[PDB]
């Protein structure tokens, strides 16, 4: 607090949700209508959240288009996760998917419909019937080309009837910790420069992803990883951050998502020599393979000179063979985006595309009840009292090493809701709102002030741009031990340059220079932890593909028959969660590794799925 003066305002809520995308708003609803005094803190108006950009759909085995079983969806999720996913959590996800989505419709979400008047469903990458044996599933429930927008506007409007109290354009700075427990959140109010401390029994982190740590992504400028930075700063280790989804078809020059629904509706990829090359890379599932696989194929075609256009450095998504009636009813959003950003009529021409950073299966680790955890070799999983987390900022981990399309809006709602279910069940009127420690939040303001007045010789925008470029180069689709190790050098230096930071706008009111400089502090933590974990992982699993360790390394070799082998010990196989523990001041990162949870919630309801060679 040392140079300037700061007006600190204190609040007292039962629970405090950081974020108002799908996940955050859903928690807010359940808690609101369960009588709790609920504060929603969000750094933008909730409709602006990234959930709103979501296009393709939300998964649930409704069986609107053909028969379906939630178990076939559970299967597909697990195989998608390349056996890094936690099966308790993937179970809870898919068990609940039909209730969660129907709730949405019942809330008023205007799903596209079938002639029978049921929710329309399209096909999407990585999904099947009959536990992998059957054909391409139709589980992906849509509102055309803008499923996320509907879902978010519905969840926002419905939040308006459950007496939550919104603190909008409030930038979260730190969790308020008190001897291992979270007692609330401290934030800056953009409108009037005030600093706000919220005292709360519970705190939910629902801040979204850190896609903006890369040079090119489909994410919003607001995807800065503040939430996972909040946890770092609170002394919590993050999980599986090296697992970064490259969605296959972002727009080439610009980064804008084109939905996997394009392919689900019958679109396909094409290379310079006119080939639907995904027949070679995935004979069964073709252009609807898992996202990690499909982006790789694409990336190889470039490297091997089948890339398309002037620089032969991207490829073509072809829809023009599909009828305009279908292109209009099923993909209006992208039809227009295609025109605006690439000058493309999708009924006549194909869209230039290239894999692009898009999701973060990584995040704050939690049990299946969405409660944040710490982990030691000797004590196991210890919950962090008071603290839940959900959505993309979380790692439950329902996605493991590759997230399956339309499982995210899903996960956000299901575990958003889980958060409120799990708190009504356990938090009881007995327990009263915790008092704040003396000095609580003082370190956060000090950082703010220090950044606000930052003297140095590197402006916040330059340092960011070089972070984003370093990262694009070293931690991309295909990684390698050296390139990674050089990458980590350049990244821990950029972390060093952080002390030579320049800001300029010295105001407290709507100072976005300041917040974007906090966002770079927040992004760097994420980025450094992402790359060191990536550098250390000498295997290939899901999105994370090592050229110099091209094999997936499980406790067995699941290509051979199981019986007859001896189980490899924990320290030589990589079927295990990465944990990054970072000192915010120094930047020093250390690693531990936490075992995957293979058992389901209930064997009598569903059997777990032992690992196998992953192929589409």
């Amino acid at each position: 607090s040392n140079i300037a003066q700061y007006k600190v305002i204190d609040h007292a809520y039962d629970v405090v949700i950081i974020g108002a995308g799908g996940a955050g708003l859903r928690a807010a609803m359940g808690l609101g209508e369960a009588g709790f005094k609920t504060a929603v803190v969000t750094k933008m108006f909730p409709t602006r959240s990234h959930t709103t950009a979501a296009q393709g759909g939300i998964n649930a085995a409704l069986g609107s288009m053909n028969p379906d079983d939630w178990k076939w969806h559970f299967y597909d999720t697990v195989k998608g996760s390349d056996w890094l996913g936690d099966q308790n959590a993937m179970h809870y996800l898919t068990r609940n998917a039909v209730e969660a989505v129907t709730e949405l419709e019942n809330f008023g979400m205007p799903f596209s419909r079938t002639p029978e008047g049921k929710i329309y469903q399209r096909s999407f990458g990585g999904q099947s019937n009959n536990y992998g044996k059957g054909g391409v599933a139709k589980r992906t429930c849509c509102v055309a080309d803008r499923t996320g927008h509907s879902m978010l506007h519905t969840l926002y409007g419905n939040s308006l009837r459950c007496h939550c109290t919104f603190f909008i354009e409030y930038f979260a700075l730190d969790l308020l910790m008190d001897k291992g427990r979270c007692v609330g959140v401290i934030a800056l109010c953009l409108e009037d420069g005030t600093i706000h401390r919220f005292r709360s029994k519970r705190t939910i982190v629902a801040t979204g992803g850190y896609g903006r740590a890369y040079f090119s992504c489909t994410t919003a400028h607001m995807n800065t990883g503040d939430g996972t930075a909040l946890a770092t700063r609170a002394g919590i280790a993050l999980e599986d951050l090296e697992f970064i989804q490259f969605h296959p078809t972002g727009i080439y020059g610009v980064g804008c998502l084109i939905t996997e629904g394009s392919r689900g509706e019958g679109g396909f990829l094409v290379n310079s020599e006119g080939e639907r090359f995904m027949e070679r890379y995935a004979p069964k599932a073709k252009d609807l393979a898992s996202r990690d696989v499909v982006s790789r194929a694409e990336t190889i075609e470039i490297m091997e000179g089948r890339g398309v256009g002037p620089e032969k450095d991207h490829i073509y998504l072809q829809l023009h063979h599909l009828p305009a009636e279908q292109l209009h009813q099923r993909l209006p959003g992208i039809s227009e985006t295609a025109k605006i950003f690439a000058g493309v009529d999708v009924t006549k021409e194909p869209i230039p595309v290239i894999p692009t950073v898009h999701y973060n299966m990584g995040g704050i680790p939690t049990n299946y009840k969405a409660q944040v955890i710490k982990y030691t070799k000797e004590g196991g999983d210890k919950i962090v009292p008071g603290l839940y987390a959900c959505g993309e900022c979380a790692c439950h981990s329902v996605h493991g090493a590759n997230r399956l399309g339309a499982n995210s809006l899903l996960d956000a709602v299901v575990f958003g809701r889980a958060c409120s279910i799990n708190i009504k069940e356990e938090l009881k009127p007995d327990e009263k709102i915790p008092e704040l420690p003396e000095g609580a939040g003082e370190e956060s303001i000090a950082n703010l002030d220090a950044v606000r007045y930052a003297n140095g010789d590197v402006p916040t925008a330059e340092l960011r741009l070089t972070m984003q470029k370093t990262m694009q180069k070293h931690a991309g689709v295909f990684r390698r031990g050296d390139i990674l190790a050089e990458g980590v050098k350049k990244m821990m230096d950029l972390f060093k340059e952080l002390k030579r930071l320049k800001t300029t706008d010295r105001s407290l009111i709507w100072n976005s220079d300041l917040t974007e400089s906090l966002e770079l502090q927040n992004l760097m933590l994420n980025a450094t932890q992402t790359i060191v974990a990536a550098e250390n992982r000498k295997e290939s699993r899901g999105a994370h593909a090592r050229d110099d360790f091209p094999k997936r390394e499980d406790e067995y070799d699941y290509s051979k028959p199981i019986e007859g082998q001896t189980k490899r010990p924990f320290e030589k196989h990589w079927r295990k969660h990465t944990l990054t523990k970072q000192d915010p001041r120094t930047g020093h990162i250390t690693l531990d590794y936490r075992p995957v949870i293979d058992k389901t919630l209930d064997p009598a309801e569903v059997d777990w799925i032992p690992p196998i060679i992953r192929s589409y």
Partner: protein
């Protein structure tokens, strides 16, 4: 430092609270319907008064323009003469002034019909120039 003061919820319209103590403002729209039908009715009236002239038209123009301009000026008053810009008493005053306008408009029209050439003839004479 964090030696601070207890804060309050920001200003937020709770629309379920609002639904406890509100009975719908009696409707408008009935009045909006007649406003507009009336304007439609005035469509033939204007071509008629190009052809047929005299004292009995002068009365129909007079009633129909008065009553139409009444509603017309009530709208413009409620746009540019607002409490926020004028203060509350001055705004009620220009509101009242809209009633003065209608009443004086009629009295002036009636007078002109009744002690001068009247509307239709008045037009003829400027046109004859």
């Amino acid at each position: 430092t964090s030696a601070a003061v207890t804060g309050a919820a920001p200003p937020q319209f709770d629309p379920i609270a609002a639904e406890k103590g509100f009975k719908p403002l009696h409707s408008h729209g009935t009045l909006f319907k007649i406003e507009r039908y009336f304007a439609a009715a005035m469509v033939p009236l204007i071509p008629a008064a190009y052809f047929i002239h005299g004292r009995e038209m002068d009365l129909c123009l007079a009633l129909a323009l008065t009553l139409h301009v009444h509603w017309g000026v009530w709208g413009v008053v409620n746009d540019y003469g607002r409490p926020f810009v004028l203060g509350d008493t001055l705004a009620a005053a220009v509101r009242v002034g809209a009633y003065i306008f209608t009443a004086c408009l009629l009295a002036g029209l009636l007078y002109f019909n009744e002690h001068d050439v009247g509307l239709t003839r008045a037009f003829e004479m400027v046109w004859e120039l």
